[PDB]
Amino acid sequence: ASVYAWNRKRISNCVADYSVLYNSASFSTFKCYGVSPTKLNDLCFTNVYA
Amino acid sequence: GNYNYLYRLFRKSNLKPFERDISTEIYQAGSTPCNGVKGFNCYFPLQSYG
């Protein structure tokens, strides 16, 4: 979308491996904040959003 | 900014009690082999708060 009304997708009821995402150097950037990328593969959440 | 005082953001392994480390090598956080230079998730680990 136009960034003023950015898309939100709710993510739930699923297993996650974010390293499938951040291992790929295909993006112009992949950065993480508050937590380092590796740690996110250990975590559990009630909801996730993209 | 004063820049006399320097910080290490990341390391390959955690320090033992009173372990000490002067080494300045580029840290591989992800899929880029650093080989002495920065890249996609390959970072110079040293910082200063300025």
Among residues A12, A41, A18, A29, the alpha carbon closest in space to that of B40 is found at A29
> CA geometry: angle at A50 spanning A3 and A37, to 5°?
115
State this model's resolution in angstroms.
3.7
Q: Which residues of B touch A (CB under 8 A)?
A: 10, 29-32, 40-41
Which method resolved this structure? cryo-EM
Between CA B40 and CA B42 the distance in angstroms is: 5
* N-term to C-term CA, chain B: 4
Contact at CB, A30 and B41, closer than 8 angstroms:
yes
Q: Which residues of B touch A30 (CB under 8 A)?
A: 30, 40-41
